[PDB]
Design a protein around this ligand. Structure first.
Ligand SMILES: O=C(Cc1ccccc1)Nc1cccc(Cl)c1
Length: 186
Protein backbone atom coordinates (compact mmCIF):
# COMPACT_ATOMS: atom_id res chain seq x y z
CA UNK A 1 0.00 0.00 0.00
CA UNK A 2 1.01 3.67 -0.45
CA UNK A 3 1.36 4.22 3.29
CA UNK A 4 3.15 0.95 4.04
CA UNK A 5 5.49 1.73 1.15
CA UNK A 6 6.22 5.25 2.54
CA UNK A 7 6.91 3.93 6.05
CA UNK A 8 9.20 1.18 4.71
CA UNK A 9 11.19 3.77 2.68
CA UNK A 10 11.45 6.14 5.62
CA UNK A 11 12.70 3.46 8.03
CA UNK A 12 15.80 2.97 5.86
CA UNK A 13 16.91 6.56 6.65
CA UNK A 14 16.13 6.45 10.38
CA UNK A 15 19.15 7.45 12.43
CA UNK A 16 17.25 6.73 15.68
CA UNK A 17 18.73 8.19 18.90
CA UNK A 18 22.37 8.15 17.69
CA UNK A 19 22.86 11.96 18.02
CA UNK A 20 20.21 12.58 20.70
CA UNK A 21 22.37 12.75 23.88
CA UNK A 22 24.93 15.24 22.53
CA UNK A 23 25.11 18.41 24.67
CA UNK A 24 23.37 20.88 22.37
CA UNK A 25 20.55 23.38 22.66
CA UNK A 26 17.91 20.93 21.36
CA UNK A 27 14.86 21.53 19.13
CA UNK A 28 12.69 19.05 17.28
CA UNK A 29 10.42 19.44 14.25
CA UNK A 30 7.66 17.21 12.98
CA UNK A 31 7.41 16.60 9.25
CA UNK A 32 3.69 15.65 9.08
CA UNK A 33 2.66 13.44 6.16
CA UNK A 34 -1.03 13.57 5.26
CA UNK A 35 -2.67 11.34 2.64
CA UNK A 36 -5.41 13.16 0.66
CA UNK A 37 -6.86 12.48 -2.77
CA UNK A 38 -4.68 9.45 -3.23
CA UNK A 39 -1.39 11.40 -2.80
CA UNK A 40 0.93 12.22 0.10
CA UNK A 41 1.20 15.79 1.33
CA UNK A 42 3.30 17.63 3.86
CA UNK A 43 1.67 19.92 6.40
CA UNK A 44 3.30 23.30 6.98
CA UNK A 45 2.61 26.20 9.33
CA UNK A 46 2.95 29.89 8.82
CA UNK A 47 4.40 31.42 11.98
CA UNK A 48 2.38 34.18 13.60
CA UNK A 49 3.34 37.77 12.62
CA UNK A 50 3.55 38.71 16.34
CA UNK A 51 6.41 36.24 17.10
CA UNK A 52 9.82 37.89 17.57
CA UNK A 53 11.89 35.24 15.66
CA UNK A 54 10.90 34.55 12.01
CA UNK A 55 7.40 36.10 11.94
CA UNK A 56 5.30 35.03 8.97
CA UNK A 57 7.81 32.35 7.81
CA UNK A 58 6.74 28.90 6.63
CA UNK A 59 7.94 26.24 9.09
CA UNK A 60 7.20 22.72 10.22
CA UNK A 61 5.59 22.35 13.63
CA UNK A 62 8.20 22.05 16.41
CA UNK A 63 10.17 23.83 19.06
CA UNK A 64 12.62 23.63 21.94
CA UNK A 65 12.94 20.51 24.04
CA UNK A 66 11.82 20.93 27.66
CA UNK A 67 12.36 18.84 30.75
CA UNK A 68 9.05 17.01 30.45
CA UNK A 69 9.99 15.40 27.14
CA UNK A 70 10.95 11.72 27.42
CA UNK A 71 12.90 12.05 24.17
CA UNK A 72 13.31 14.23 21.06
CA UNK A 73 10.22 12.72 19.36
CA UNK A 74 8.17 13.83 22.36
CA UNK A 75 9.33 17.41 21.82
CA UNK A 76 8.05 17.35 18.27
CA UNK A 77 4.66 15.91 19.28
CA UNK A 78 4.23 18.29 22.25
CA UNK A 79 4.93 21.32 20.10
CA UNK A 80 2.74 20.06 17.24
CA UNK A 81 -0.17 19.62 19.72
CA UNK A 82 0.35 23.17 21.05
CA UNK A 83 0.65 24.71 17.56
CA UNK A 84 -1.97 22.88 15.47
CA UNK A 85 -3.94 20.67 17.92
CA UNK A 86 -2.44 17.39 16.74
CA UNK A 87 -3.05 14.79 19.45
CA UNK A 88 -0.67 11.85 19.99
CA UNK A 89 -3.17 9.21 18.90
CA UNK A 90 -3.35 11.10 15.56
CA UNK A 91 0.31 10.67 14.68
CA UNK A 92 2.60 7.72 14.12
CA UNK A 93 6.28 8.76 14.33
CA UNK A 94 8.02 6.63 11.72
CA UNK A 95 11.57 7.89 11.91
CA UNK A 96 14.17 10.36 12.84
CA UNK A 97 15.97 11.98 9.88
CA UNK A 98 19.43 13.52 9.84
CA UNK A 99 19.65 16.34 12.37
CA UNK A 100 20.39 19.92 11.35
CA UNK A 101 23.34 21.74 13.05
CA UNK A 102 23.02 25.50 13.43
CA UNK A 103 24.73 28.40 15.24
CA UNK A 104 27.53 26.13 16.52
CA UNK A 105 25.50 25.19 19.63
CA UNK A 106 22.09 23.96 18.38
CA UNK A 107 20.85 20.68 16.98
CA UNK A 108 17.44 20.37 15.36
CA UNK A 109 16.10 16.84 15.07
CA UNK A 110 13.41 16.17 12.39
CA UNK A 111 10.87 13.37 12.82
CA UNK A 112 8.56 12.18 10.08
CA UNK A 113 5.03 11.47 11.29
CA UNK A 114 2.10 9.84 9.52
CA UNK A 115 -1.04 11.87 10.33
CA UNK A 116 -4.51 10.38 10.81
CA UNK A 117 -6.99 11.00 8.02
CA UNK A 118 -9.54 12.47 10.51
CA UNK A 119 -7.13 15.10 11.84
CA UNK A 120 -8.18 18.67 11.20
CA UNK A 121 -5.82 21.44 12.15
CA UNK A 122 -6.85 23.90 14.77
CA UNK A 123 -4.25 26.68 14.27
CA UNK A 124 -3.32 28.25 17.63
CA UNK A 125 -3.33 31.95 16.60
CA UNK A 126 -0.75 33.05 19.20
CA UNK A 127 1.76 30.84 17.34
CA UNK A 128 0.41 29.97 13.92
CA UNK A 129 -1.15 32.32 11.33
CA UNK A 130 -1.95 29.55 8.86
CA UNK A 131 -1.65 25.81 8.18
CA UNK A 132 -1.53 24.38 4.68
CA UNK A 133 -0.72 21.22 2.74
CA UNK A 134 1.67 20.81 -0.17
CA UNK A 135 1.69 17.66 -2.26
CA UNK A 136 4.98 15.84 -1.66
CA UNK A 137 5.53 15.52 -5.43
CA UNK A 138 5.71 19.31 -5.73
CA UNK A 139 9.19 19.17 -4.17
CA UNK A 140 10.48 17.18 -7.14
CA UNK A 141 9.47 20.01 -9.54
CA UNK A 142 9.25 23.16 -7.45
CA UNK A 143 8.77 26.69 -8.73
CA UNK A 144 12.10 28.23 -7.76
CA UNK A 145 12.79 31.94 -7.23
CA UNK A 146 16.25 33.32 -6.41
CA UNK A 147 16.31 36.11 -3.77
CA UNK A 148 21.55 34.78 -3.54
CA UNK A 149 19.52 31.70 -2.36
CA UNK A 150 16.74 29.41 -3.69
CA UNK A 151 13.09 29.98 -2.58
CA UNK A 152 10.14 27.71 -3.48
CA UNK A 153 6.80 29.33 -4.35
CA UNK A 154 3.79 27.08 -3.93
CA UNK A 155 0.34 28.26 -4.99
CA UNK A 156 -2.60 26.43 -3.42
CA UNK A 157 -5.04 25.64 -6.31
CA UNK A 158 -7.98 25.70 -3.87
CA UNK A 159 -7.65 29.44 -3.26
CA UNK A 160 -4.72 30.86 -5.29
CA UNK A 161 -2.66 31.79 -2.25
CA UNK A 162 1.10 31.64 -2.78
CA UNK A 163 3.46 30.58 0.01
CA UNK A 164 7.23 30.94 0.09
CA UNK A 165 9.11 27.95 1.44
CA UNK A 166 12.82 28.28 2.10
CA UNK A 167 15.82 27.29 4.14
CA UNK A 168 15.85 24.22 6.41
CA UNK A 169 12.11 23.79 5.84
CA UNK A 170 12.54 23.59 2.05
CA UNK A 171 15.55 21.36 2.36
CA UNK A 172 13.77 18.86 4.58
CA UNK A 173 10.72 18.83 2.29
CA UNK A 174 12.90 17.86 -0.66
CA UNK A 175 14.64 15.17 1.37
CA UNK A 176 11.33 13.56 2.38
CA UNK A 177 10.07 13.75 -1.23
CA UNK A 178 13.23 12.03 -2.52
CA UNK A 179 13.07 9.31 0.13
CA UNK A 180 9.42 8.46 -0.48
CA UNK A 181 8.95 9.12 -4.20
CA UNK A 182 12.23 8.12 -5.87
CA UNK A 183 12.25 5.06 -8.13
CA UNK A 184 8.54 4.24 -8.17
CA UNK A 185 6.64 2.42 -10.96
CA UNK A 186 3.61 4.42 -12.21
O1 LIG B 1 9.52 26.55 15.79
C1 LIG B 1 9.13 25.70 15.00
C2 LIG B 1 10.01 24.55 14.57
C3 LIG B 1 11.46 24.93 14.57
C4 LIG B 1 12.29 24.60 15.63
C5 LIG B 1 13.64 24.94 15.59
C6 LIG B 1 14.15 25.62 14.52
C7 LIG B 1 13.34 25.95 13.46
C8 LIG B 1 12.01 25.60 13.48
N1 LIG B 1 7.89 25.67 14.46
C9 LIG B 1 6.83 26.54 14.79
C10 LIG B 1 5.81 26.71 13.86
C11 LIG B 1 4.76 27.55 14.15
C12 LIG B 1 4.71 28.21 15.36
C13 LIG B 1 5.71 28.01 16.28
CL1 LIG B 1 5.65 28.83 17.81
C14 LIG B 1 6.78 27.18 16.02
Amino acid sequence: SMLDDAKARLRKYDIGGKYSHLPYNKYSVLLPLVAKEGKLHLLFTVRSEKLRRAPGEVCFPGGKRDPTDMDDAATALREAQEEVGLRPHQVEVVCCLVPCLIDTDTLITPFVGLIDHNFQAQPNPAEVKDVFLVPLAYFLHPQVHDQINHIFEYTNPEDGVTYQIKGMTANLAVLVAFIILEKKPT
